[PDB]
Design an enzyme around this catalytic site. Structure first.
Site, mmCIF file in Angstrom:
data_model
loop_
_atom_site.group_PDB
_atom_site.id
_atom_site.type_symbol
_atom_site.label_atom_id
_atom_site.label_comp_id
_atom_site.label_asym_id
_atom_site.label_seq_id
_atom_site.Cartn_x
_atom_site.Cartn_y
_atom_site.Cartn_z
ATOM 1 N N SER A 156 -0.782 15.395 -12.534
ATOM 2 C CA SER A 156 -0.425 14.436 -13.606
ATOM 3 C C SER A 156 -0.868 16.216 -14.516
ATOM 4 C CB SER A 156 -1.394 14.194 -13.855
ATOM 5 O OG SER A 156 -1.976 13.961 -14.980
ATOM 6 N N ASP A 193 0.902 -0.751 -0.545
ATOM 7 C CA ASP A 193 0.520 -0.085 0.142
ATOM 8 C C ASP A 193 0.978 1.208 0.153
ATOM 9 O OD1 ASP A 193 -1.455 2.819 0.181
ATOM 10 O OD2 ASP A 193 -2.628 1.389 1.966
HETATM 11 N N1 LIG Z 1 -4.120 3.569 0.366
HETATM 12 C C1 LIG Z 1 -4.128 4.958 1.764
HETATM 13 C C2 LIG Z 1 -5.221 5.584 1.545
HETATM 14 C C3 LIG Z 1 -6.260 5.393 1.480
HETATM 15 C C4 LIG Z 1 -7.142 6.516 1.615
HETATM 16 C C5 LIG Z 1 -6.557 7.908 1.544
HETATM 17 C C6 LIG Z 1 -7.159 9.221 1.400
HETATM 18 F F1 LIG Z 1 -8.939 8.925 1.663
HETATM 19 F F2 LIG Z 1 -6.602 9.922 2.258
HETATM 20 F F3 LIG Z 1 -6.905 9.761 0.239
HETATM 21 C C7 LIG Z 1 -4.702 7.867 1.752
HETATM 22 C C8 LIG Z 1 -4.044 6.443 1.417
HETATM 23 N N1 LIG Z 2 -5.892 2.273 1.377
HETATM 24 C C1 LIG Z 2 -5.886 0.511 2.377
HETATM 25 C C2 LIG Z 2 -6.887 -0.167 2.307
HETATM 26 C C3 LIG Z 2 -6.451 -1.866 1.218
HETATM 27 C C4 LIG Z 2 -7.597 -2.574 1.564
HETATM 28 C C5 LIG Z 2 -8.800 -1.982 2.351
HETATM 29 C C6 LIG Z 2 -10.363 -3.436 2.652
HETATM 30 F F1 LIG Z 2 -10.066 -3.948 0.839
HETATM 31 F F2 LIG Z 2 -9.456 -4.642 3.763
HETATM 32 F F3 LIG Z 2 -10.808 -3.272 2.860
HETATM 33 C C7 LIG Z 2 -9.092 -1.314 3.175
HETATM 34 C C8 LIG Z 2 -8.417 -0.289 3.518
#
Ligand SMILES: NCc1ccc(C(F)(F)F)cc1
Ligand SMILES: NCc1ccc(C(F)(F)F)cc1
EC number: 3.4.23.22
Length: 330
Positions: free
Chosen positions: A199, A35
């Protein structure tokens, strides 16, 4: 040193990607969601509330000869989708495709939200944003990438996500056989802790390219592409019968429609997302309404270049002292 690991979609929609990770001694292999939008390495464990575990592989620190409890350290994280989890902290040896880090903070879940329990294929997350976002208290911890940086041949990792197919995460080197043409690098802002970039614009299908600055984050942990309402409206206006549905929570379209591609700008270069990448299938089993992979960021507060966008490219996360993002066609 370097590391290389295969990453695999968890389902037929590419909702997420899992990568095998070895934790502890002897190795306990867990399938983690890499992630680049978060900075915590957390796993289901023998400490997780039993009713909250449903098929996940768990990390058992008591069976690892290298696991050390980090005294007094706790963690608690909330993701932008409303998911959350929390627990305590161990340090242990963590290896990704041959690349080993000793003394990595492994955050053991005591409580996880329902969305994690219901995802039997994801044993945890490996955060690859900047360490300033790590939630360990009272002593913040470093990410796997930050801990490995000094020993990497080059302070980079690359994401090569597949469309309905396996892909690769590489650490410490750029595979020049994995992309076509040149890599275009673009500046990154770390001020919010994300791989945040700008972008240079977009085009819908074969339409004229619109030069306009779109600030957003490169987030392997987010499934869809979240862009400003004006851009998303321009895209779905080209799909007959598409509409924004408040009950469904986004743009849907008739499953019989063919979707146009979406192009986004990286400096003077262009990344083309084929229309098939934007189809996420029926909103419910048997429905003829399908869910779109490009959605509005208006309710989020930030634009997110998620898997829908990243899997159309070879993506370099350059963690040099001045960090940059590289995009190449593939
Ligand atoms: N994949 C992690 C993640 C999930 C949500 C956000 C948000 F909502 F803050 F943009 C950033 C990073
Ligand atoms: N953005 C991070 C993240 C990744 C996967 C999930 C899930 F799929 F487990 F809900 C939630 C949040």
């Amino acid at each position: 040193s370097t590391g290389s690991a295969t990453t695999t979609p968890i389902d037929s929609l590419d909702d997420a990607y899992i990568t095998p990770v070895q934790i502890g001694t002897p190795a306990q292999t867990l399938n983690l969601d890499f992630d680049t939008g978060s900075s915590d390495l957390w796993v289901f464990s023998s400490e997780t509330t039993a009713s909250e575990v449903d098929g996940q592989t768990i990390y058992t620190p008591s069976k690892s000869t290298t696991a050390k409890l980090l005294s007094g350290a706790t963690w608690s994280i909330s993701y932008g989708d409303g998911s959350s989890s929390s627990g305590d902290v161990y340090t242990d040896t963590v290896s990704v495709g041959g690349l080993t880090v000793t003394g990595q903070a492994v955050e053991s879940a005591k409580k996880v939200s329902s969305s994690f329990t219901e995802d039997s294929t994801i044993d945890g997350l490996l955060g690859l944003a900047f360490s300033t976002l790590n939630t360990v208290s009272p002593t913040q911890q470093k990410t796997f990438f930050d801990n490995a940086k000094a020993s990497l041949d080059s302070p980079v990792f690359t994401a090569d996500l597949g469309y309905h197919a396996p892909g690769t995460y590489n650490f410490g080197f750029i595979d020049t056989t994995a992309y076509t043409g040149s890599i275009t690098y673009t500046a990154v802002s770390t001020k919010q802790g994300f791989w945040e970039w700008t972008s240079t614009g977009y085009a819908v299908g074969s339409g004229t390219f619109k030069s306009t600055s779109i600030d957003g984050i490169a987030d392997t942990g987010t499934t869809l592409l979240y862009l400003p309402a004006t851009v998303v409206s321009a895209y779905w206006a080209q799909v007959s019968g598409a509409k924004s549905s408040s009950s469904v929570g986004g743009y849907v379209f008739p499953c019989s429609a063919t979707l146009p591609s979406f192009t986004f700008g990286v400096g003077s270069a262009r990344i083309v997302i084929p229309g098939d990448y934007i189809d996420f299938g029926p909103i419910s089993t048997g429905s003829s309404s399908c869910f779109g992979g490009i959605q509005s960021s208006a309710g989020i507060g930030i634009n997110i270049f998620g898997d829908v966008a990243l899997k159309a490219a070879f993506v370099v996360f350059n963690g040099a002292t001045t960090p940059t993002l590289g995009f190449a066609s593939k």
